[PDB]
Structure 1
């Protein structure tokens, strides 16, 4: 018989009991743990189910899922129960921060390393605990933490990086490898190729990483000679998450996209400049003619969909849904293009297809309003949040459907929506702001932290801002959100 059979059975028995108290985990959550944390993680969740739930620690089920659904998830759970009190009272971290650190492969190692290295990183290297938490909140945080401690001097002194840039580089998966590769390749990338330290930090600062830097060093001549690409363009391909793969794929598919399809280098660079650029490029070469086929979709419109995060997923979804969205929903091809032209366009397209009829028929929005909401990054989240909260915002808080659509039609719309309905009563009733004012602040990107920063100022007044009225604080907050408040705050 199959050997996995016995272990799957135990997996399923143990799973059954977790649907009960005190955790009550649905299916998606149970799968999640089994998939990444494994069988033992599902068992450890059960074994510890009582200890984590209520006092002392008081962790929501979501948080227990978050910690368990990773490799070594069992070890993380044991370690969280043991160290969270330690890190909160002896180091001053919030429980949210402990959970963040815990919620990655090797979570146990990261927690035990923060416990061990945080004093020396703040005392001797002058890092903040916020910085130490960030570095620790990725896979191999233990490694990045030890590497930071070992290389923060030499990287600042012999190479001229600020501690912020060392922290910025370190705060990614594979953090240890990026740091080591910057130590080695920073003089080569700066002195030989005329790159700024900041451009190099950007190339290093994210998931890839050590591969991006090494691939930039390798392919930067070949690219700026034959294809006549600017160094700036090469940095942009490498620094945007496309990394190694995006560069290698630009090298291949630049002539092919240009010649056969009449794209400029510029359009190719912009397609490559995001997570999975390689995926976007190869998808373009493969799908552009199918999209523009006897019709039809124009080239430039295929490039726009491509010049975005998950462009590949966007492109494929467009190929599959353009027909049903136009035909059975009365959308124009221009509207489908605009929905897809954001990070997570795939998510937004599917969410429009599934919710457009419901938001119209049951909530009284136009298709235009639905499309407007969808046409921002995170568009899916925003449409799901309009569906849940439109009745509560309108009925309990006084808001018009127009205002709600306005709040939701920005990146982070979801966050703004939840924040408005959560903070509107105290802002208006307790401090005399008008709903219109609250709606105004929230009707921008960064709406949530803009709202939060006003509440913070009106309930624990920083003297630095006292010379500003509510109307002024509101005007400032509409202008530049939390950053402008903070910028102003650093003047009192």
Structure 2
């Protein structure tokens, strides 16, 4: 495509077709996906050994191969997986899914090779579970996290009195080596000098870009409290709730402005920045707040709500754009649009709503009020889309009212709930004698899926705290609490 070599672009497009060909069945989006983050060697390599990967001792799925390949160094990983997957699975007892998960990142070769080399000395001499070692390694720069963990885990646990859980939490992100190193250096300083509980320091470090956040706090903590009247707790919030270095800096820079000119409480400013891409939200509310509280739009309170979530920027922009079209064209109050946008993935919901509202309301016979309810949760897009698919099959093949399906959908994780009802409603109702309404009741909550999955596992294989509770109790329990409630009872 680009410019350097000559004429061998044939060979590239040759292969591009043969991967739609018959070991893998790659669609366009996937080849694109590989080509994009993986590069051409990646695409070359998939083809290169696509039969070897599909069967043999590996028996990987296509989407697994895609997953491994579509990353910087993808080629290297694919080669390194062929070599090591069997030995890591047998000689160190990992699942394939685990080996893949290690591999599906930038520098997978380095991660895999380093696991092989250090999985024992960690699990043995530092009593770490393999789960934990995989966790540390399942990230960009895994080699470094692993390697650094080995070096510092004695030191961090002896001299600074940290739990191993905490060390793993820190290392189990991108930039582990850095966060670890930076903690070691700054833990005393931050603790004695700036007066922070080690718990808070670990909180901060246990995100991506922790090194930055630690350093930035040390520097900016005094100022934000002294000059800007923030509590250290409030500062730590920002620095560990996603905002990181960026948010802290942005807060300092934009705090006076948003309070004087745009008239917000610092309590709100913190709320807004205590999230991923605070910087983004903040800057977005600095603009846009006017045009939202004018161009009829909304109250500051409402704007703050929309912004106080991951990807607030997206939400605010999607609101300003689609607010008129939804309100005027599809007949929604601004109150509803705000509700829809006041969640993770607001942009996604609003957009999905606009395109599925009519579809649901004519073709599937829902009220708008219903659609809004479905949309007014985290992962709205997913529910709406799943409702669309699964409504007819749920009502016909499994005989539920719509009002029921909407109930199941109207909760965070709606998608999972619905899907899981589909899998389990039969086995539950016939094999263990539950009644749809019960199964629906269980599902109509947060954590509806794990509730159901738990409820089944229990009935099919009556785990240690057997009998005692009859089925109707387990149901009532699961509605009340869910998987927490059932696990909790099992522990008694």
Cα deviation, residue 38, structure 1? 0.6
Task: State whether residues 15 and 44 of structure 2, in contact with CA within 8 Å, keep that contact through their aligned partners in structure 1.
Answer: yes
Kindly indicate whether the alpha-carbon contact (under 8 Å) linking 2:89 and 2:96 is maintained by their aligned counterparts in 1: yes
**Structure 1 equivalent of residue 381 of structure 2:** 380
Equivalent position SS for 1:397: coil
Instruction: For residues 243-262 of structure 1, give each alpha carbon's deviation from its aligned partner in whole angstroms, at most 9, with x where no partner exists.
Output: 00000000001110111111
In the TM superposition, residue 346 of structure 1 has moved relative to its aligned partner by 0.7
Per mean C-alpha deviation after superposition, the further-off stretch among 373-382 and 339-348 is 373-382
Structure 2: unaligned runs, 5 residues or longer: none
Tell me how far 1:489 sits from its aligned partner. 2.2
C-alpha displacement of 1:449: 1.7
> Number of aligned pairs?
491
Is 2:302 the partner of 1:301? yes
Q: CA deviation at 1:152?
A: 1.6
> Structure 1, residues 87-108: CA drift from partner, whole Å, max 9, x if none?
2222222221121111110111
Q: CA deviation at 1:73?
A: 0.6
Q: Quick one: distance in 2 between partners of 1:174 and 1:282?
A: 26
- Residue 484 and residue 21 in structure 1: after superposition, are their counterparts in 2 closer, same or farther (change >3 A)? same
The verdict on how the C-alpha distance between 1:420 and 1:324 changes in structure 2, with shifts beyond 3 A counting, is: same
Distance change in 2, residues 1:8/1:189 (3 Å) = farther
Q: Deviation of residue 143 (structure 1)? A: 1.1
| 1:301, distance to aligned residue in structure 2 (A) | 1.1
User: Aligned equivalents of 1:484 and 1:16: distance in 2?
Assistant: 52
Post-superposition CA distance 1:69-121 (Å, at most 9, x none): 00111111112222222222222222211211111101111122222222222
Deviations 1:338-358 (A, max 9, x none): 111111111111111111111
Superposed displacement of residue 467, structure 1: 2.2
Q: Which residue of 2 aligns with 1:347?
A: 348
- After superposition, the Cα gap between the structure-2 partners of 1:404 and 1:464, relative to the gap in structure 1 and judged at 3 Å, is same
Judge which range, 25-34 or 80-89, deviates more: 80-89
Q: Quick check: 2:122–2:150 contact (8 Å CA) kept in 1?
A: yes
Distance 2:370 2:43 in 1: 43
Equivalent residue, structure 2, for 1:244: 245
CA contact (8 A) 1:208 1:241 kept: no
Root-mean-square deviation (CA), in Å?
Answer: 1.6
CA drift of 1:141 comes to 1.2
Q: Deviations over 1:246-299 (max 9, x none)?
A: 000000011101111110001100110111010000000011111112423221
Task: Please give the alpha-carbon distance, in whole angstroms, between the structure 2 residues aligned to 1:427 and 1:145.
Answer: 44
Farther-moved stretch of structure 1 (368-377 vs 63-72): 368-377
The equivalences for 1:44-123 within 5 A come to 44-123=45-124
Shift of 1:487: 2.4
Could you tell me which runs of 5 or more consecutive residues in structure 1 were left unpaired when the two chains were aligned.
none
Q: Is the partner of 1:5 in helix, strand or coil?
A: coil
Q: Which has the higher mean CA deviation after the structures are superposed, 435-444 or 219-228?
A: 435-444
Closer/same/farther in 2, CA of residues 40 and 465 from structure 1, 3 Å limit: same
How far 1:478 sits from its partner (Å)? 2.1
Deviates more, 1:194-203 or 1:62-71: 194-203
Does the residue aligned with 2:8 lie in a helix, a strand or coil?
A: helix
Distance 1:125 1:6, change over 3 A: farther
Residue by residue over 1:50-71, the C-alpha shift from the partner in whole angstroms, topping out at 9 and shown as x without a partner, is 1122343222211111111001
Task: Name the SS for the 1:207 alignment partner.
Answer: coil
Q: Which residue of 1 aligns with 2:486?
A: 485
Q: How does 1:387-426 map to 2 (within 5 A)?
A: 387-426=388-427
Question: Counterpart of 1:465 in 2: which secondary structure?
Answer: coil
Whether the 8 Å CA contact 1:351–1:383 is kept in 2: the answer is yes
1:136 aligns with 2:128: no
CA contact (8 A) 1:37 1:70 kept: yes
- Label 1:127 to 1:363 Cα distance change in 2 as closer, same or farther (>3 A): same
- Give me the whole-angstrom Cα distance separating, in 1, the residues matched to 2:476 and 2:443: 12
Q: What's the offset of the Cα at 1:406?
A: 1.5
CA contact (8 A) 2:408 2:418 kept: yes
Q: 1:188 to 1:364 in 2, by over 3 A?
A: same
Relative to 1, partners in 2 of residues 1:333 and 1:438: Cα closer, same or farther, differing over 3 Å?
A: same
Shifted more, 381-390 versus 80-89: the winner is: 80-89
Looking at structure 1, the residues matched to 378 and 284 of structure 2 have their Cα atoms a distance apart, in angstroms, of 21
Question: How big is each residue's C-alpha offset from its partner over 1:165-201, in whole Å with a ceiling of 9 and x where there is no partner?
Answer: 1111111111111111111111112212222222111
| Post-superposition CA distance 1:414-472 (Å, at most 9, x none) | 12221111122222211112222222222222222222122222222211243222222
Which 10-residue stretch deviates more, 32-41 or 477-486? 477-486
Partner secondary structure for residue 424 of structure 2: helix
Say which is worse superposed, 221-230 or 431-440, in terms of deviation. 431-440
**Contact 1:465 1:488 (C-alpha < 8 Å) held by counterparts:** no
**Of 276-285 and 380-389, the range deviating more from structure 2:** 380-389
Deviations 1:326-374 (A, max 9, x none): 1211111111111111111111111111111111111111111111111
Distance 1:396 1:77, change over 3 A: same
Distance 2:478 2:161 in 1: 36
How far the C-alpha of 1:477 sits from its partner, in A, is 2.0
- Do the aligned partners of residues 91 and 428 (structure 1) sit closer, same or farther apart at CA in structure 2, a change above 3 Å counting? farther
Q: Is the 8 A contact 2:291 2:297 kept in 1?
A: no
> How far, CA to CA, are the matches of 1:41 and 1:361 in structure 2?
46
CA distance in 2, matches of 1:449, 1:375: 21
